[PDB]
Amino acid sequence: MKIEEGKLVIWINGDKGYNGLAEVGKKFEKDTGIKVTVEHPDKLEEKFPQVAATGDGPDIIFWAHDRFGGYAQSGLLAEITPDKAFQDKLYPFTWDAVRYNGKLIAYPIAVEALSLIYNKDLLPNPPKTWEEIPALDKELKAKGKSALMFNLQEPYFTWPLIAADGGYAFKYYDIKDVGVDNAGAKAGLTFLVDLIKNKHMNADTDYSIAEAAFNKGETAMTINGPWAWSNIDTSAVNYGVTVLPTFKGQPSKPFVGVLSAGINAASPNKELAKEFLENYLLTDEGLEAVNKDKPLGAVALKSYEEELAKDPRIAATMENAQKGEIMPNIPQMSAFWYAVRTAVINAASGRQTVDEALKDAQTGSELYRQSLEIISRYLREQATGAADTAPMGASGATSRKALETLRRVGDGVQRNHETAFQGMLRKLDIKNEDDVKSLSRVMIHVFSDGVTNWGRIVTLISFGAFVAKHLKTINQESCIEPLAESITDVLVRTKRDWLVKQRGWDGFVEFFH
Numbered sequence: 001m002k003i004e005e006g007k008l009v010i011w012i013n014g015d016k017g018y019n020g021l022a023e024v025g026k027k028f029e030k031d032t033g034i035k036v037t038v039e040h041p042d043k044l045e046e047k048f049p050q051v052a053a054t055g056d057g058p059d060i061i062f063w064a065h066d067r068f069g070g071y072a073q074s075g076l077l078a079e080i081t082p083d084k085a086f087q088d089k090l091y092p093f094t095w096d097a098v099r100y101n102g103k104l105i106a107y108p109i110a111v112e113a114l115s116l117i118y119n120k121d122l123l124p125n126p127p128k129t130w131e132e133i134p135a136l137d138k139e140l141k142a143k144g145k146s147a148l149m150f151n152l153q154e155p156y157f158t159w160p161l162i163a164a165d166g167g168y169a170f171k172y173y174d175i176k177d178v179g180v181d182n183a184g185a186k187a188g189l190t191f192l193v194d195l196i197k198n199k200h201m202n203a204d205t206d207y208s209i210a211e212a213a214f215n216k217g218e219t220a221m222t223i224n225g226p227w228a229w230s231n232i233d234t235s236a237v238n239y240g241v242t243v244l245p246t247f248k249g250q251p252s253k254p255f256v257g258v259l260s261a262g263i264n265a266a267s268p269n270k271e272l273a274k275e276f277l278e279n280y281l282l283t284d285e286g287l288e289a290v291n292k293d294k295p296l297g298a299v300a301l302k303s304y305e306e307e308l309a310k311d312p313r314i315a316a317t318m319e320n321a322q323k324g325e326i327m328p329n330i331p332q333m334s335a336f337w338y339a340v341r342t343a344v345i346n347a348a349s350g351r352q353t354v355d356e357a358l359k360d361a362q363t364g365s366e367l368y369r370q371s372l373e374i375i376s377r378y379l380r381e382q383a384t385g386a387a388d389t390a391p392m393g394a395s396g397a398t399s400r401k402a403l404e405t406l407r408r409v410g411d412g413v414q415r416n417h418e419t420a421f422q423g424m425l426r427k428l429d430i431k432n433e434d435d436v437k438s439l440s441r442v443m444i445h446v447f448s449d450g451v452t453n454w455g456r457i458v459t460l461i462s463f464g465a466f467v468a469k470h471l472k473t474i475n476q477e478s479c480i481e482p483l484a485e486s487i488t489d490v491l492v493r494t495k496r497d498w499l500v501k502q503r504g505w506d507g508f509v510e511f512f513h
Ligand SMILES: CCc1sc2ncnc(N[C@H](C)C(=O)O)c2c1-c1ccc2[nH]ccc2c1
Pocket: 420, 421, 424, 442, 443, 446, 447, 450, 456, 457, 459, 460, 463
């Protein structure tokens, strides 16, 4: 099994206090003889699910809590079971952030929210509104400075503004209700785009560029989290940390993250990982070592948070946090961020209009759920002979028309392939939920081998329906939902970009109209 026993490998993002974490690791080694390696791989949040699915990767992964539901759904995390006395050492709301399907899937570390960071020597009174920024930038440009620079390549940083006037990810979670392309989101992202068009900001600005400009005194404000304050301390900029500006009179609403540590389900060192996280890291001295390297924010550990809470920068962080919302941890968060990242980048660069960009983001964010709705309904009605009577939601005319198209087209595909499907089904031993796991390997492989088009997607789904009929016949109707989920995963994981390019299921209805 790929992960080595008797050592701990930890992954944490490169903007965090990884040298402090490695000090905690040295302490552990001194008491236990177990060496701890801390690494900060690029794109770790994307790499983890790839490697862990093979039984490889780090023993411990640190990331905000939003990615952890996806990893837990995929079976990539160990359930953690801290006892009552340990649970009571942390804030309950930090535990809530790492609860998925009623199980704790990670240890919470610290609460992170973005704030407005400003240079007090350039801007003694920071703007209370977004709307006053253009005028401020004009005033600053006369003196060779700019008003505001922040990372436009990661949507986390633009989210507070998108959300201010009513953008939202998933309504509180109703995965059916997505608010990425509503009027509020459009208003916020249009304001950003106008800043860029009026040369108050540059579309190419990334994390490093914005940090460098702020810490060199070139720009009067940035938007960043507590991890950033160490580099600003070293630069000797006189800075303040404050509430984000309002937009259309309403607060900026940052997405609040709880930095959390999960244990790899494939680790043979789970007991050492638990001992390290509970008895070395989540202690006053452990968190202090980390926080001294790069500030964590509002830590989850009550004893130590009471000391940090007196710092005005933490107060500001918590003020922004209360105006914001805790991120969801559901599995489609990954897709939501991918869609939104592209929409912001393309709207900023002018490759797409705001309307265009947010439409595509809404399609991408809704794709898994919409696909599972169609596929699960078609498989279940095929298997049983009766349609599901529940409505689709308020966003569900697309689901409905896609199901109707699928019935029409799929009737013929199953009819014409009945002999071939009967043959393929016989080769396979599909008798219970264990077997369906295997099918995913087969179905991915077979599906990916050929060309990408709607006809072949209909054939994949049609075979799924043929299997569902068989499942029902042998009293394994409970396997139909897992089959539908597995087909949906295959389809959206391998064809997401192609699907969004087609306008999702509306494209399907169009192709076969
Ligand atoms: C694992 C079962 C799947 S998934 C799938 N996805 C798209 N298309 C498929 N079949 C067509 C003919 C295609 O490739 O266009 C299949 C088959 C499938 C099913 C039965 C068969 N008999 C011979 C070959 C074959 C293939």
